[PDB]
Amino acid sequence: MKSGHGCSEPLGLKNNTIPDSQMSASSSYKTWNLRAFGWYPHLGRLDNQGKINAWTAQSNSAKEWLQVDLGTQRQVTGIITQGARDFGHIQYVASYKVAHSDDGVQWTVYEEQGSSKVFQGNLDNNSHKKNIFEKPFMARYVRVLPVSWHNRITLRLELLGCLE
C-alpha cells in the first residue's frame, strides 16, 4: 500500500553501490596514466571520505576529457554536478560538452542553439546543480569534454535514474 514518488536515484549511493568502474577520464591531477590505474576518479559521490569530492584534470587543459562507462543500459531521469577546490582555492568548470550514448555510437550532446550548444555553467564548487527529467532515456556510456574552466578543471558529473 505504498507509492514511489522519487524518480531521481543515484548510481552507487542507494542500492546499486556501483564500484570504481563507472567514471573514468583521460588523466587526473594525480600525475598521469601509465601502467595500472593511475587516476583516482569516482569522487563526485557524496560523503566523500577524502575532501576533493570531485575529479580533476591532469594537464589542466581542454585536451582533458571525462567519460562514464555503464554497460548496464539504464534510463536516466536527471543529473547532478558539483565542483571542487584545492585545499582552499575554489575551482570549477564552466563550458563543457557532455553527451550521452545508449548504443555507444549515438552521442547525444543535447543541442539547443540549433547546431550543438555545449553545457555551460560554473555553479561554483560549494553549490550543486541537478536537472529534472526534462528528457529521460536509456544510456550505456557518456562522454564529456570541458573547454572553458575556472581556476582548475575540478568537478564531478553524476547521472540520476528512475530504475523503472
Curated annotation (Swiss-Prot):
The listed locations are:
Membrane; Secreted; Cytoplasmic vesicle, Secretory vesicle, Acrosome membrane
Instruction: Give every F5/8 type C domain span.
Output: 7-162
The glycosylation sites annotated in the UniProt record are N15, N125
Q: What induces it?
A: Isoform 1 is induced by insulin, prolactin and hydrocortisone in mammary epithelial cells. Expression of isoform 2 is repressed by the same treatment.
Q: How is it modified after translation?
A: N-glycosylated. Isoform 1 also exists in both an O-glycosylated and a non-O-glycosylated form.
The UniProt comment on domains reads: The F5/8 type C 2 domain mediates high-affinity binding to phosphatidylserine-containing membranes.
Its job: Contributes to phagocytic removal of apoptotic cells in many tissues. Specific ligand for the alpha-v/beta-3 and alpha-v/beta-5 receptors. Also binds to phosphatidylserine-enriched cell surfaces in a receptor-independent manner. Zona pellucida-binding protein which may play a role in gamete interaction. Plays an important role in the maintenance of intestinal epithelial homeostasis and the promotion of mucosal healing. Promotes VEGF-dependent neovascularization.
Name by which UniProt lists this protein: Lactadherin
Q: Which organism is it from?
A: Mus musculus
Species classification: Eukaryota, Metazoa, Chordata, Craniata, Vertebrata
Gene for this chain: Mfge8
Span within the parent record: 306 to 463 of 463
